[PDB]
Amino acid sequence: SLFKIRMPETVAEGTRLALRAFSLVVAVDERGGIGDGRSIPWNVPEDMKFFRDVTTKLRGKNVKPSPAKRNAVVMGRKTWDSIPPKFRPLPGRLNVVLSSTLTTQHLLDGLPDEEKRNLHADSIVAVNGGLEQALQLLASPNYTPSIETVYCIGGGSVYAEALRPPCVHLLQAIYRTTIRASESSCSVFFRVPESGTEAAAGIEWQRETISEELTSANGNETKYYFEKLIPRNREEEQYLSLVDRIIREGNVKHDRTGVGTLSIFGAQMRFSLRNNRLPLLTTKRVFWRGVCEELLWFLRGETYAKKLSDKGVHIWDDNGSRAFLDSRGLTEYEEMDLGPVYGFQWRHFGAAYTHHDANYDGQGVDQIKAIVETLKTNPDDRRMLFTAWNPSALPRMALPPCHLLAQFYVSNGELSCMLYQRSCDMGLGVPFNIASYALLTILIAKATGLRPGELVHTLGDAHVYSNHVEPCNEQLKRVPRAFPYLVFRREREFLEDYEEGDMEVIDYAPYPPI
Amino acid sequence: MSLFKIRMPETVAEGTRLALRAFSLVVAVDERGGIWNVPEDMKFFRDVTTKLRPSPAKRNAVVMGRKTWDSIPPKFRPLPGRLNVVLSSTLTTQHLLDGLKRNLHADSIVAVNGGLEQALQLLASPNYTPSIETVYCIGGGSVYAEALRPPCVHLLQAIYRTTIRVFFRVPESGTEAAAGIEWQRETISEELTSANGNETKYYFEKLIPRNREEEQYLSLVDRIIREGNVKHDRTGVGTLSIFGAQMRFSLRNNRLPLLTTKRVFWRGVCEELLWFLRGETYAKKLSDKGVHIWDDNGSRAFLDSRGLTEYEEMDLGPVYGFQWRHFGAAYTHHDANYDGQGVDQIKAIVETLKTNPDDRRMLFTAWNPSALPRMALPPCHLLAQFYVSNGELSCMLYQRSCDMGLGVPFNIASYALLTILIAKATGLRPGELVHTLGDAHVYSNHVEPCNEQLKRVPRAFPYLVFRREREFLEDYEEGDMEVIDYAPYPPI
Ligand SMILES: NC(=O)c1ccc[n+]([C@@H]2O[C@H](COP(=O)([O-])OP(=O)(O)OC[C@H]3O[C@@H](n4cnc5c(N)ncnc54)[C@H](OP(=O)(O)O)[C@@H]3O)[C@@H](O)[C@H]2O)c1
Ligand SMILES: NC(=O)c1ccc[n+]([C@@H]2O[C@H](COP(=O)([O-])OP(=O)(O)OC[C@H]3O[C@@H](n4cnc5c(N)ncnc54)[C@H](OP(=O)(O)O)[C@@H]3O)[C@@H](O)[C@H]2O)c1
Ligand SMILES: O=c1ccn([C@H]2C[C@H](O)[C@@H](COP(=O)(O)O)O2)c(=O)[nH]1
Ligand SMILES: O=c1ccn([C@H]2C[C@H](O)[C@@H](COP(=O)(O)O)O2)c(=O)[nH]1
DSSP, X not given: OOSSOBOOTTSSTTTSOSSOOEEEEEEEETTXXXXXXSSOSOOOHHHHHHHHHHHHOOSSSSOOOOXXXXXXXXXXXXXXXXXXXXXXXXXXXXXXXXXXXXXXXXXXXXXXXXXXXXXXXXXXXXXXXXXXXXXXXXXXXXXXXXXXXXXXXXXXHHHHHHTSTTGGGGEEEEEEEEESOOOTTOOEEOOOOOTTOGGGTTOOEEEEEEOOOEEOSSSSOOEEEEEEEEEOOHHHHHHHHHHHHHHHHOEEEEOTTSOEEEEEEEEEEEEEOGGGBOOOOSSSOOOHHHHHHHHHHHHTTOOBTHHHHTTTOOTTHHHHSHHHHHHTTOTTSOTTBOOSOTHHHHHHBTOOOOOTTSOOTXXXXXXXXXXXXXXXXOTTOSOOEEEOOOTTTGGGSSSOOSEEEEEEEEETTXXXXXXXXXEEETTTHHHHHHHHHHHHHHHHHHHHTOEEEEEEEEEEEEEEEGGGHHHHHHHTTSXXXXXXXXXXXXXXXXXXXXXXXXXXXXXXXXXXOO | OOTTSOBOXXXXXXXXOOSSOOEEEEEEEXXXXXXXXXXXXXXXXXXXXXXXXXXXXXXXXXXXEHHHHHTSOTTSOSOTTEEEEEEOSSOOHHHHHHTOOOSTTTTTEEXXXXXXXXXXXXXXXXXXXXXXXXXXXXXXXXXXXXXXXXXXXXXXXXXXXXEEOOBOOOOOTTOTTTTTOOEEEEEEOOOEEOSSGGGOEEEEEEEEEOOHHHHHHHXXXXXXXXXXXXXXXXXXXXXXXXXXXXXXXXXXXXXXXXXXXXXXXXXXXXXXXXXXXXXXXXXXXXXXXXXXXXXXXXXXXXXXXXXXXXXXXXXXXSOHHHHHHHBTOOOXXXXXXXXXXXXXXXXXXXXXXXXOTTOSOOEXXXXXXXXXXXXXXXXXXXXXXXXXXXXXXXXXXXXXXXXXXXXXXXXXXXXXXXXXXXXXXXXXXXXXXXXXXXXXEEEGGGHHHXXXXXXXXXXXXXXXXXXXXXXXXXXXXXXXXXXXXXXXXXXX
């Protein structure tokens, strides 16, 4: 306990979600109009179907909406009133209504009968505020992470709030149907701000998809099309442009097997960790549970990989086997005893390692505890770094450290981190390490009374394996989506006590397998 | 009588009405950025907020929270020479005055029942715009917080921060909190020592939002000087030039790209543009307004040097605006009646803009090879094309020959105005100006001054507001509009 890092009284502060991320669904005419102030002056059943499916369906396969896992739909009072009483609430979704007039009971009182009220009791909530207040409520443990995706559907006032800060920064996707008509009957309008405009607040909107022009079977042959707009993700673009550079200009190298590689030397990337943001790459899914479990394992100063494999994390299995250890001369280590790797050096630098069973408390230099104490007392210190690169210990490690050094910096109450990585597998390793040092920085922020800032990633030998070239090249076609967020469901007394189940990654919508 | 003019729609003032007025911020912080009697800071505070570039017709405004008003020791309040704007949900302007002396300071205080935004709405109204030169936010924590977030942050022209040795935080560039704004220091002072007890250490900072649009211009001036080809003209006048460039300028939200690193003669810009739109050719209509830009090209001597021997002084022939409104019409003299003569390109564009926004032929030219020999000067800005997106009107200007020092900033302003006026005539909001340059040059005599101007950090652009409207486009007068919050650098 004396050797552990005690979390400050402000643990959940500076990590708590202010607003839940959301997507937006809207239909417009070509003049950008949405309604007359009361209803919608066109009828395209095909769009009503799309609206239903996009807001109703969960991500993935064979899904079933439920009280424990469902989508939420946020609307204004006038939008609620525009739904015919028999068709409301919107089935299979949590209906969040914004209103200063009506309470949650008032909304139920507007339902035809008691049977409908008793049944749909759990599926209707009133918020006395705007969309921001709703996102604050949907950021609550009761709703986060039970609600998979929030959808704003909400009408001009709510749309306007959605497209302006602070809410627009939480907007992951705009699903926009355009009706080919110029309706004069429209009094309410909708517009998305353009790339370099003041109103865009630094967001660059671009289309992921646009459909062909379609014809409605509504009797009027009305033309319409679909668009999905997403906020340009320049941070993931860094990683993609590096991959592309490696393919096009990288030197051919061969590793310690004769396995071919394309590589460059010297690169740098940056990622915002502010306001719960988590740089998990979207163009290819990251094994977050592995990232999380292993980072905690590092932080504890652990060396027994069986603690990972017992948790279904098999990333170290091949490097912990009898055959592999033996091939490094480590004939005395039991299987899965990796030696004094990584987090052992973080917590116990220079300590004399023999086996994982030994008790290393207070042995070596605890670099992480030293950093935490410095951060809370003199955050402007320029020596706040730790290393796993220990030439004295290297020969007795299963693997020499890859991500080998990290340095901290503080500005405006924000903690930033620079990672140094000597050898960077772009296809699989790099996205994993970005997620890993994002988590670390967030946890150190919580341990020190600071808000998370930025992750800087310095790469040495950045490379793409021979068999990754073609997959990675097809991945380059994908337009990066908005990043997920990290949320803590509970806290701990000590940093070392944190569990993978204490936190949840929300609003992670990566592209399917290549 | 007015059948050949362009009638404005009912929605004239809608697309150019000022929602919020621009402002600057003054704050004193400790070494941790938090929130004590440094007289030099008080003198600075007074000088910045009080001084004009002061009367009930021409003064600065100061916006403050209620408790900041409370913390000003009575008799120092109201702050002299400034309109005092106090934000309060509890106190009216009568209440504030009751706390005071009275009578003569009635015209000096106003309570606003709301936040900074609501106060900026009020100051944007004709009563306080442009009668108030600069708005200063000095108000407490809650007011500063509102100042450094949208919508208000988009109207913040400068931050004057004294650091002396609730937290005041300027969002770092690239941050979501920054909202696309890049804050940077125009100036930072040496660490100064106060004259008092304790020998207090303190320094001044002036932070400004990076003007990347004016940087295009300065980046081009720089490239022309460092890399431009040398030419000496028919008179032996030296020039440095490059060929082919392009700049963009936003016109949204009343924004006016008047360059700040070197003052632009706005009044001349505006009078001349209106003169173009009217199809005018008699430059004496401008000189009789104190705009003398065409004098050296309208004189008998110059006219004769172009062999234009039958034109009376200041009659320039079928130049510019004549081609805009009467393309290909036969020109005799300026006083002749040209109604219905030639092709009215402006009116055709206006009608197309309202009926078929996506048309790709919405352009006009002054480049008329048939009429060039009869012009005092061939057109420099010779083609403009229009474009509509998201209810916004955009414009592309083509300029064959571009004097970077004096001509170019003038023409940016000129076509900025044009686009604003055409949007008003067509039911659209101003979008973007795109400016294509041909032979872009800096004169030998401008190299040194231009090089010094390059040291100056571009400031935030001013705004154009319309004080009154007109029934016809051609009826617009320079007095109908005002440029607000234009704070250019002094002479080179
Ligand atoms: N084309 C489309 O895809 C689409 C989709 C949805 C809606 N619409 C149309 O949009 C029109 C309605 O839009 P609208 O903007 O006028 O109304 P609205 O957005 O639908 O609802 C506004 C109402 O929401 C409540 N509200 C919103 N913000 C609030 C806040 N900050 N604090 C407290 N309460 C708040 C207020 O309820 P109280 O009055 O009770 O205080 C307010 O009157 C209708 O014609 C509808 O058909 C179109
Ligand atoms: N170091 C510096 O440069 C500096 C500059 C200014 C102030 N300060 C200090 O800070 C102290 C006060 O700071 P503060 O944080 O309390 O801010 P404040 O200046 O006192 O502003 C808060 C007050 O302004 C009014 N207000 C603000 N926003 C409003 C809105 N949205 N709608 C209606 N009313 C609104 C409210 O007045 P009502 O309660 O009457 O409704 C509110 O109580 C002062 O004592 C001063 O000494 C320091
Ligand atoms: O954390 C890690 C660990 C290994 N890698 C990859 C990078 C390299 O291709 C191999 C390590 O091989 P080595 O020869 O030890 O540098 O694994 C990674 O990208 N991130
Ligand atoms: O609107 C204008 C008109 C003239 N200029 C400058 C550009 C050229 O240096 C001269 C015209 O001389 P010229 O030889 O016709 O290109 O004036 C300008 O920059 N903007």
